[PDB]
Design a protein around this ligand. Structure first.
Ligand SMILES: Nc1ncnc2c1ncn2[C@@H]1O[C@H](COP(=O)(O)OP(=O)(O)OP(=O)(O)O)[C@@H](O)[C@H]1O
Ligand SMILES: Nc1ncnc2c1ncn2[C@@H]1O[C@H](COP(=O)(O)OP(=O)(O)OP(=O)(O)O)[C@@H](O)[C@H]1O
Ligand SMILES: [Mg+2]
Ligand SMILES: [Mg+2]
Lengths: 53, 483, 468, 484, 235, 128
């Protein structure tokens, strides 16, 4: 009985872990997009400053 | 020479004209070109002037003659604009004939200083249970509405505009609130449909619309909020109360970025110029309540901001947050669950706070802000087993949240908000099926309007609950819930 | 007197041509008579061909090429001395409290050299603020330099007003408050509160001088009002020989304002568009705010953080100039943990075992160790949850959560919108409470009891209420 | 005439554009009629671009300007010891004038390939982590790098304070004269630092070169080079010098200011094109000279402030590329209670074991291995997964070694005291001690050794090497103390 | 080097350190000359400057100029335009890795990122090629399994996976070698291992003839003979 | 190749590789001081590879039935396909054969990542 309960509990625990991992993936995907845009903008500003003198 | 009051265009491009002459021109003076398009003298330089064009540069060719207007950029103001739709420069675009002007006021003016002002002590009743209960707005306040696209920002602002009907039909100028709505960068069809929506609800006769739609040249989009603020400042300065909605200041920021970069001014963070803060501040500082010596007029601002990806930490959102006296954060995670108006009560704050709130609501709505934050805390870890206290907390939160939902275009008066929030806070809803809470309201108010109209009239007139009135409301609530 | 003609008006920048054989020195004040009164320009550069470039202290709208400009013969100068107490001073040094002229015997220029190295004095005395997080993890120094770092909406103004309420009412020495690009509403609120509490007293003695260049002002005014606030505080420091408080909200606006004009002055933009002169402008404003052997200046500076980016050049440059720093964070605010001070980024040179004592140092260090341990685990707690932690990790996370909530405190000035009565906690009480919490004496108390209570006695009382 | 004089064409933001001065040398020092000095950085076909060493209020258009013939030079000699001087060597401590053995130019070419010698002598910092894991040799260019308020200045200042032991001695070869260069720091911070040095009596062998925040950008720029020239006197006269640049990031910012105001073409992050040249020609001046050259040395400890730990930034990358090693300080370690919070993984010394006290090398050889294993084992165990017994023992060892390296500020340890501690930790004698009590153990253990085994400490100091007999005696003493 | 090649007919070795300094100095001079900076500040002419430097270094029909080129990698980023430009010119890349060094496995070459034009069965023979390919497969499988082992350890893996991981660890440590120059960084006498013996040793380890040897016997040893000797010495 | 294409013959052109052509065009543009763009490339760098690659075509019977197949090679630093030039070329072409170093080390050579590799013309061209 303890074995059956433990296997079911581990199943549910890994389900919860997968939910949480998906949520974290969404958060850091948003953060990655923001950082990508920021990097492009800052490097382009540097290039423009070098060009405009 | 004739170059004193006139000039010859040297060059045209990127929405900027370079003109020769105009020796006697004032900085920021409005000039008129041959084709009738107008511009603003932005740069005065030795031997030339830079003119920002309030229109398509197709309308201006090199060699054209340009004429001084002699007036800094200004717009007509007065009560005659009520019910009118005007462009950024105060020209009528509804097609209902000329504007009637009490006078003209500059687009740019310094906001009133420290001494002329007064502490905000009057409510702007939005008719929304969540806003009026948890993040009240006062007259003279400047409350940010912020959130993703299609999250209901304009719905909140327009419900606030529509609610003012019951008082604008009244006799007291001290209660009437006149609403200016500013469309910046919005689709022209959307503004037309919004005007039609106002006219259906008869909210147009006390409202003014200033529109700089998406296709209009960037300078007009940049200018529109300032001229709309100048229009509202007439009511402010003449002892009357006004409400101005900027929808959106983000698109104004985009238009100002366009101007800045086409002037080749250095890009800053997110390619915006450093001046963008001074773009909004000198605007939003114009929302104020004046002292008794100044006639006690007030101008209330509701700036609208669109956050990509929900970033309240972005450059422009943080700039406006640092300028306003509060924020109403609308959350997509709630809006797409059907939780509408979708106020994120945790991040939403009104830092004028209770000073603006009606005392009856401050009584019945006691600690509801804290209870809903607590519910959002306890409900997070609910999905280690639930203690009975946490079960009660979840029941209360579920049922209060269902009670704070509201249909669009259905403002709900304070005498109607008070009984519902009383019932929710004092626990009479704990035993009622939550899927029927939408029914509950409809029945409960009706019951009160039939059996207890005296209590509603007293709540309206006194603005306070005495222990007698408090006990009568309690008795009515129990009588209904038993029923 | 020397006079010239305006030749170019761009934004806040005005070029002036002086066909006379002599030109005004840099930083000189020039005056244009206008229908509103007068417009004051400050000489920023000499361009050649007898042309100077100047920064306007007010709106340039209405200027016409050829307007006559008159040189005042010296820098912008402001009233100094006790006649300025209880009054509101404009950037150019004029009363805007509408109570008539200021009758001070002296007026001093806003630009002056910082004190030399030999003049520096080094205090090591703790300033008790009554705030748990500050008094525990980042004690303030009397006569030192204090900074608040925070983005928008985290509540820097509430914190500044709580500091004023707690300190300025008992400092004895004169106070100066400089609004640099903050809300006019909140300057009005400060003035009203000071009038009601008697810190400002229209019928008699007043102990605070107000200087305001709030955010509605052009960049030229915002770039200089801080120097007027300084110039008054320096007169109280060096000439009156008094101790001084010098509040500056928000000093970041001094830097930002400069950037707004830098592109018009013709400079090559620095990183993210800031002016090249950022570091030296900051230095000239900042280490002029200092304690000296003539007098003591305690200064509290609110530093805005654009886009919550603490790596932005302005906050990064400002960090080096401060003795004590408290870093308000949006991440803490979202939890509802006001005052939202980040307990692992607040810093102070007085948190030293020789200054705070060994007990206080041990308590603070162990509090920070617990919070850091909790912060490290948040990935595991987020994904796997509490269950998979070791029992020692579970105990440490419980104490860390309770400590986080115990560092929250209700300020009186926030009671208007929080609805929670204000509490003030003594330094000894704070240290004792956190020592008791770390010793596990209250491991049985639910964490909710620790939220928004002024001390462990209130924790016990709130636990009792939660039990009934 | 215009050959030896000129007329100011323009003034602004600390730059003067001057007409004339036909015969001026590049970088020559110039004097304006108002008395303020400047430095002629730009020579152009019709103009000279002069960066001012003071307030531009003093200079105004039309002013007459005079050559000097002098390229920037500063006084040098032992008379500066105990003094605080500005970027040009003028005293600012408020004491009397400064005696100088001579004058030396600011920019001077570094010692060539031939005169140098391989670094072999140690700079004993008195910090257990540094001396044990990232040794600093005399003539080494050791970078200290990290975020704001992590402990960089504390590390350098502890290194400076530790030299009391030898600066009091007769042996001139063991001494180490200290120069601390405060660039961009506020004056009160330098005042507190000299207060600390005088409190610990370390000022009598130190020199402070201060270019604080309010100093015009050229002086913040030029202070490191003049301080290098000051230390090079000791280097070239057979004496040993330690120069701490606190910090080079603010010098780079000052050079960005100058270059941008002269309108020179910007590079990455708006820095000028040749900041790497700036720092390379500054740092290559540290050297260990051969016996023909008097065997002197100059040791450099550059400080670099990273923003958000980002070493990929331009200037941090440059200085990491130039220097012979890095002492990475990290805030996360600081708040875990590790002090001085050195990240022992990222930190490396390229001279390394070649410049380490031999006894401490003997005992510390295994320390790096245990810590390297511990980092991975702890990374695994943090997740809570089941553990092998030996891996658990590696956790036991690593946590206690980490605790053993903690050290209070301004409390440096002589190597005679460092050797027993690292020995006890490495050889596992600490495994039986409670992790909380390690800090007690140290404080007691030394007190035991200084009492019951003083001969061991005397031999460890005077010999510098653990013979087999000394190692056996140390084993005996360590087990004796651990028993009690 | 070119004079020795073309005018004397010698075979020449041209050791260069550091090529990154050539690139960086080109960037500095370009910036000073006022050319518009390219990505991350490098000069526009980066690729052609590198080409002009590099493909002068070549084996003409008069003689061969072998060259060994040390390349600094800023921030350990091999994607930086300077290393990225340099890579295209090289016949054999020996990519040193910080990660491998932090395991203590010196000389810390990355066994997978390092690549050679000549690692072809037609050049080195099929036995050498097979051993190298199997070593790469084993190390890459071990690297892939590390992502799971970091969570669940080795207990959950299949016996085939356990065996391959253990052999991978033995091989990974066997790639270490004590250099003579390193006798200041180590007390171990330096040793030099022939190519043939290296192939034979790694073939023996791959085949499992030394599965019974503890991992530490493979650390900083020479050929497989040193593995046997050190295994006995430990035992 | 267009000579074979237009005269009714079939041709195959391999560009090895277009990243270096983009680098050379960036050099030309920057030294001519034409306005830079993202990653310092000239604004119209898309119009370089689109102008180059759209010349691959299969001609109808009236126009001679000839064709010109193109196999542009592209190098991605660190596998970053989001870079400017990889994005442009991926947009312009009819598909991609994607090679991954992780598969190459495993011994799967020629190391084609089948999941990322797509031929949008696809089955129509395949041998029945
Ligand atoms: N209280 C509400 N109840 C039900 N639906 C609502 C409510 N408020 C808004 N909506 C729905 O949301 C839709 C969009 O609302 P609204 O126009 O106010 O959003 P918005 O944030 O201003 O959008 P946009 O970014 O497109 O300008 C409305 O058409 C309506 O469908
Ligand atoms: N070993 C130590 N033990 C305890 N506290 C320490 C130690 N080293 C430094 N500190 C404390 O850490 C804080 C930062 O120290 P320090 O001033 O040396 O840092 P820094 O990196 O030079 O900072 P900044 O960037 O502000 O100049 C100070 O409170 C100092 O007292
Ligand atoms: Mg909308
Ligand atoms: Mg420091």
């Amino acid at each position: 009985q303890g074995y059956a309960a433990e296997i079911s509990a581990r199943r549910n625990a890994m389900d919860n872990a997968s939910k949480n991992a998906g949520d974290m993936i969404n958060r850091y995907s948003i953060l990655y997009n923001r950082t990508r845009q920021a990097v492009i903008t800052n490097e382009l500003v540097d290039i423009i400053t070098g060009a405009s003198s | 020479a004739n170059l004193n009051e006139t000039g010859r265009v040297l060059a045209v491009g990127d929405g900027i004209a370079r003109v020769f002459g105009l020796n006697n021109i004032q900085a920021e003076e409005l000039v008129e070109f041959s084709s009738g398009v107008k511009g603003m003298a932005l740069n005065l330089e030795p031997g030339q002037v830079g003119i920002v064009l309030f229109g398509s540069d197709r309308l201006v060719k090199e060699g054209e003659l340009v004429k001084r207007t002699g007036n800094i950029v200004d717009v007509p103001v007065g009560p005659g604009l009520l019910g009118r739709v005007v462009d950024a420069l105060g020209n009528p675009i509804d097609g209902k004939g000329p504007i009637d002007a009490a006078g003209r006021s500059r687009a740019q003016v310094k906001a009133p200083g420290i001494l002329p002002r007064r502490s905000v002590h009057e409510p702007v009743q939005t008719g929304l249970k969540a806003v009026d209960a948890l993040v009240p707005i006062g007259r003279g306040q400047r409350e940010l509405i912020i959130g993703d696209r299609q999250t209901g920002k304009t719905a909140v602002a327009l419900d606030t505009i529509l609610n003012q009907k019951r008082w604008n039909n009244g006799s007291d100028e001290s209660k009437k609130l006149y609403c200016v709505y500013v469309a910046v960068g919005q689709k022209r069809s959307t503004v037309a449909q919004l005007v039609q929506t106002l006219e259906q609800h008869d909210a147009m006769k006390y409202s003014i619309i200033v529109a700089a739609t998406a296709s209009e040249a960037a300078p007009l989009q940049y200018l529109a909020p300032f001229t709309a603020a100048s229009i509202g400042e007439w009511f402010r300065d003449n002892g009357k109360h006004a409400l101005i909605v900027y929808d959106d200041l983000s698109k104004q920021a985009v238009a100002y970025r366009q101007l800045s970069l086409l002037l080749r001014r250095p890009p800053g963070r997110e390619a915006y110029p450093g001046d963008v803060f001074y773009l909004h501040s000198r605007l939003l500082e114009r929302a104020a309540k004046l002292s008794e010596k100044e006639g006690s007029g007030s101008l209330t601002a509701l700036p609208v901001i669109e956050t990509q990806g929900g970033d309240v930490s972005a450059y422009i959102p943080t700039n406006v947050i640092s300028i306003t006296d509060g924020q109403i954060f609308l959350e997509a995670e709630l809006f797409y669950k059907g939780i509408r108006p979708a106020i994120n009560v945790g991040l939403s704050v009104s830092r004028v706070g209770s000073a603006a709130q009606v005392k009856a609501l401050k009584q019945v709505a006691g600690s509801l802000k804290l209870f809903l934050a607590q519910y959002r805390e306890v409900a997070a870890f609910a999905q280690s087993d639930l203690d009975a206290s946490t079960k009660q907390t979840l029941v209360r939160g579920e049922r209060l949240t269902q009670l704070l939902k509201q249909n669009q275009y259905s403002p709900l008066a304070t005498e109607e908000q008070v009984p519902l929030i009383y019932a929710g806070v004092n626990g009479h809803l704990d035993g009622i099926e939550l899927s029927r809470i939408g029914e509950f309201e409809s029945s409960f108010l009706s019951y009160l309007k039939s059996n207890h109209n005296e209590l509603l009239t007293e709540i309206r007139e006194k603005g306070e609950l005495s222990k007698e009135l408090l006990a009568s409301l309690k008795s009515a609530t129990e009588s209904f819930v038993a029923t | 007197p020397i006079t010239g003609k305006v030749t170019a008006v761009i934004g806040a920048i005005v070029d002036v041509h002086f066909e006379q054989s002599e030109l005004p020195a840099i930083l000189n004040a020039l005056e244009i008579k206008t229908p509103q009164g007068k417009l004051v320009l400050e000489v920023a550069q000499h361009l050649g061909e007898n042309t100077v470039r100047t920064i306007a202290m007010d709106g340039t709208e209405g200027l016409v090429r050829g307007e006559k400009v008159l040189d005042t013969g010296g820098p912008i100068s402001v009233p100094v001395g006790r006649e300025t107490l209880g009054r509101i001073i404009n950037v150019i040094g004029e009363p805007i409290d509408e109570r008539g002229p200021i009758k001070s015997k002296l007026r001093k220029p806003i630009h002056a050299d910082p004190p030399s190295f030999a003049e520096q004095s080094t205090s090591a005395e703790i300033l008790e603020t009554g705030i748990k997080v500050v008094d525990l993890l980042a004690p303030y120094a009397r006569g030192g330099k204090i900074g608040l770092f925070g983005g928008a909406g985290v509540g820097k103004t509430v914190f500044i007003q709580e500091l004023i309420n707690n300190i300025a009412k008992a400092h004895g020495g004169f106070s100066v408050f400089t609004g640099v690009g903050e809300r006019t509403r909140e300057g009005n609120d400060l003035y009203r509160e000071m009038k009601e509490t008697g810190v400002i007293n229209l019928e008699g003695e007043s102990k605070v001088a107000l200087v305001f260049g709030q955010m509605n002002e052009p960049p030229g005014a915002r770039a200089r009002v801080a120097l007027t606030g300084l110039t008054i505080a320096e007169y109280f420091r060096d000439e009156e020989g008094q101790d001084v408080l010098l509040f500056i909200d928000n000093i970041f606006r001094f830097t930002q304002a400069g950037s707004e004009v830098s592109a018009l002055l013709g400079r090559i933009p620095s990183a993210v568009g800031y002016q090249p002169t950022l570091a030296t402008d900051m230095g000239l404003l900042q280490e002029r705010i200092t304690t000296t052997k003539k007098g003591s200046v305690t200064s509290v500076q609110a530093v805005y953080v654009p886009a919550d980016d603490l790596t932005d050049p302005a906050p990064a440059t400002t960090f080096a100039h401060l003795d004590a720093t408290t870093v308000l964070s949006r991440g803490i605010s979202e939890l509802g943990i006001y005052p939202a001070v980040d307990p692992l980024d607040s810093k102070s040179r007085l948190l030293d075992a020789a200054v705070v004592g060994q007990e206080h140092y041990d308590v603070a260090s162990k509090v920070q160790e617990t919070l850091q341990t909790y912060k490290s685990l948040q990935d595991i707690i987020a994904i796997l949850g509490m269950d998979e932690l070791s029992e020692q990790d579970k105990l440490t996370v419980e104490r860390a959560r309770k400590i986080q909530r115990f560092l929250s405190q209700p300020f009186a000035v926030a009671e208007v919108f929080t609805g929670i009565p204000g509490k003030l906690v003594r330094l000894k009480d704070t240290v004792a409470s956190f020592k008791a919490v770390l010793e596990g004496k209250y491991d049985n108390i639910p964490e909710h009891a620790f939220y928004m209570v002024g001390g462990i006695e209130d924790v016990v009382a709130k636990a009792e209420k939660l039990a009934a």
